[PDB]
């Protein structure tokens, strides 16, 4: 039985409104209702992997596994494994595979943050799951933040809490948070970003929403308009958004939108917003390609409507040859030439980098490069020619060119990451002089750039 080399996965995210589902939610795992909706004729084709994350959620642990995996049966005729579950308070994450998955998946950790402080350390934050499947690891956060249309600031004080604290992944990666330890990064919830326009427009919105024109909607929604300022999911994609605002809805019902201001909402207007949303981020130059997004039409207990995402995603096999692991490989090579790395800190200490991957035993420590002045008031680490000859523990190019390489940039004085960023080995050459670029970011912010050539020899 061959090894794959692309997976499906499916996304789910339902903010349930602390109610029961119906008896009925297939349409959720079959990617039908509003939106990109996946063709009928993929309805019996199971995904390889189901993550569902649900905010506001009444239900047991066992209560909800027992109707995802027989909503899962029902559509497939699979009965799919449990990887992983994990609930911080009504905040849920459940990982299933199908069977001959099993011996494919290892590595499996869970973790959940909690956000605000005395107040606001009450009922948000986030669980996650992460594991390897095969060559490939694999992350998923399901994050309920900050609810309210002033609390935008808020919600990306949220989003950084969760991506530093949030220990997913190989702890091995020390300098790393979860937004580099994995190949696909999967971040989904309830992010409660509104659209961002005067209470008066509300029956403008929802005649807006009937029409199905939601290009003057999403030009007010507050995480675009986040995004697009970099104040938050900096360097993370979201497919198109062709389906209508999945929240506040009326119970029951799916005709109308429940905006005004009440008690129960804090004397709070809820104008229809796309609060319930899926981001990813893989590494360089891997395959990840959307096949659906969207909400359901038909599941109306909560007054969200659930939303799906559906990825193929590229993974590679658990490489074995003569040599490597357990030793390196002399027919490959990794170098660096004309490298440097632009900081934004103010700061002036000594700076060296550290090379973490896979296909090294261990990570590499550089020497310390040269400190000078950009023209624009720059502060730039000049590594030129300096930066070591890295060692993979495999040379095959079938494995090498999947590969990446993580870099960190620390201070000398301190040990602390100021940036880290990622290169592909998915190069155009072997044992050819390329062009190398990361952005580098610290706490998911972005504090610099590193840049520079790479040269690869492989075995071929
Ligand atoms: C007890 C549960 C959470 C568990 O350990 N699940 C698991 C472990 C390894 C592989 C697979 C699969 N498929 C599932």
Same mark, same amino acid.
């Given at each position: 039985?061959?090894?794959?080399?692309?997976?499906?996965?499916?996304?789910?995210?339902?903010?349930?409104?602390?109610?029961?589902?119906?008896?009925?939610?297939?349409?959720?795992?079959?990617?039908?209702?509003?939106?990109?909706?996946?063709?009928?004729?993929?309805?019996?084709?199971?995904?390889?992997?189901?993550?569902?994350?649900?905010?506001?959620?009444?239900?047991?642990?066992?209560?909800?596994?027992?109707?995802?995996?027989?909503?899962?049966?029902? $559509?497939?005729?699979?009965?799919? %494994? =449990?990887?992983?579950?994990? *609930? #911080?308070? @009504?905040?849920?994450? /459940?990982?299933?595979?199908?069977?001959?998955?099993?011996?494919?998946?290892?590595? $499996?950790?869970?973790?959940?943050? %909690? =956000?605000?402080?005395?107040? *606001? #350390?009450? @009922?948000?934050?986030? /669980?996650?799951?992460?594991?390897?499947?095969?060559?490939?690891?694999?992350?998923?956060?399901?994050?309920?933040?900050?609810?309210?249309?002033?609390?935008?600031?808020?919600? @990306?004080?949220?989003?950084?809490?969760?991506?530093?604290?949030?220990?997913?992944?190989?702890?091995?990666?020390?300098?790393?948070?979860?937004?580099?330890?994995?190949?696909?990064?999967?971040?989904?919830?309830?992010?409660?970003?509104?659209?961002?326009?005067?209470?008066?427009?509300?029956?403008?919105?929802?005649?807006?929403?009937?029409?199905?024109?939601?290009?003057?909607?999403?030009?007010?929604?507050?995480?675009?308009?986040?995004?697009?300022?970099?104040?938050?999911?900096?360097?993370?994609?979201?497919?198109?958004?062709?389906?209508?605002?999945?929240?506040?809805?009326?119970?029951?019902?799916?005709?109308?939108?429940?905006?005004?201001?009440?008690?129960?909402?804090?004397?709070?207007?809820?104008?229809?917003?796309?609060?319930?949303?899926?981001?990813?981020?893989?590494?360089?130059?891997?395959?990840?390609?959307?096949?659906?997004?969207?909400?359901?039409?038909?599941?109306?207990?909560?007054?969200?409507?659930?939303?799906?995402?559906?990825?193929?995603?590229?993974?590679?096999?658990?490489?074995?040859?003569?040599?490597?692991?357990?030793?390196?490989?002399?027919?490959?090579?990794?170098?660096?030439?004309?490298?440097?790395?632009?900081?934004?800190?103010?700061?002036?200490?000594?700076?060296?980098?550290?090379?973490?991957?896979?296909?090294?035993?261990?990570?590499?420590?550089?020497?310390?490069?040269?400190?000078?002045?950009?023209?624009?008031?720059?502060?730039?680490?000049?590594?030129?020619?300096?930066?070591?000859?890295?060692?993979?523990?495999?040379?095959?190019?079938?494995?090498?060119?999947?590969?990446?390489?993580?870099?960190?940039?620390?201070?000398?004085?301190?040990?602390?990451?100021?940036?880290?960023?990622?290169?592909?080995?998915?190069?155009?050459?072997?044992?050819?002089?390329?062009?190398?670029?990361?952005?580098?970011?610290?706490?998911?912010?972005?504090?610099?750039?590193?840049?520079?050539?790479?040269?690869?020899?492989?075995?071929?």
């Amino acid at each position: 039985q061959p090894e794959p080399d692309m997976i499906t996965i499916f996304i789910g995210t339902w903010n349930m409104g602390n109610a029961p589902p119906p008896k009925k939610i297939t349409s959720w795992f079959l990617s039908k209702g509003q939106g990109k909706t996946r063709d009928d004729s993929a309805d019996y084709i199971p995904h390889d992997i189901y993550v569902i994350g649900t905010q506001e959620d009444p239900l047991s642990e066992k209560e909800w596994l027992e109707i995802l995996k027989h909503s899962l049966q029902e $559509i497939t005729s699979v009965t799919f %494994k =449990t990887v992983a579950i994990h *609930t #911080l308070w @009504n905040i849920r994450i /459940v990982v299933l595979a199908k069977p001959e998955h099993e011996n494919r998946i290892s590595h $499996i950790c869970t973790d959940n943050v %909690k =956000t605000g402080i005395a107040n *606001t #350390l009450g @009922n948000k934050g986030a /669980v996650g799951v992460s594991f390897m499947f095969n060559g490939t690891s694999l992350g998923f956060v399901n994050s309920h933040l900050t609810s309210g249309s002033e609390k935008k600031l808020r919600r @990306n004080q949220n989003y950084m809490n969760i991506l530093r604290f949030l220990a997913l992944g190989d702890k091995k990666l020390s300098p790393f948070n979860i937004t580099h330890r994995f190949t696909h990064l999967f971040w989904f919830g309830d992010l409660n970003y509104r659209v961002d326009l005067p209470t008066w427009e509300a029956e403008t919105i929802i005649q807006k929403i009937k029409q199905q024109q939601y290009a003057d909607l999403l030009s007010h929604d507050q995480l675009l308009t986040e995004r697009r300022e970099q104040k938050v999911f900096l360097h993370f994609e979201e497919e198109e958004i062709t389906f209508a605002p999945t929240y506040r809805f009326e119970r029951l019902t799916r005709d109308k939108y429940a905006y005004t201001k009440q008690k129960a909402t804090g004397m709070k207007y809820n104008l229809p917003s796309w609060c319930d949303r899926v981001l990813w981020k893989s590494y360089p130059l891997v395959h990840v390609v959307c096949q659906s997004y969207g909400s359901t039409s038909d599941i109306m207990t909560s007054d969200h409507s659930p939303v799906f995402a559906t990825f193929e995603a590229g993974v590679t096999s658990q490489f074995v040859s003569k040599n490597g692991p357990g030793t390196v490989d002399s027919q490959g090579q990794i170098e660096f030439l004309r490298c440097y790395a632009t900081l934004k800190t103010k700061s002036q200490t000594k700076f060296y980098l550290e090379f973490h991957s896979s296909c090294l035993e261990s990570f590499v420590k550089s020497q310390e490069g040269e400190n000078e002045e950009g023209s624009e008031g720059e502060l730039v680490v000049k590594f030129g020619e300096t930066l070591p000859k890295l060692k993979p523990i495999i040379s095959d190019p079938e494995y090498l060119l999947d590969q990446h390489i993580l870099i960190s940039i620390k201070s000398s004085d301190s040990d602390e990451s100021y940036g880290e960023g990622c290169i592909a080995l998915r190069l155009e050459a072997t044992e050819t002089q390329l062009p190398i670029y990361t952005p580098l970011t610290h706490h998911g912010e972005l504090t610099g750039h590193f840049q520079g050539e790479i040269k690869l020899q492989t075995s071929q």
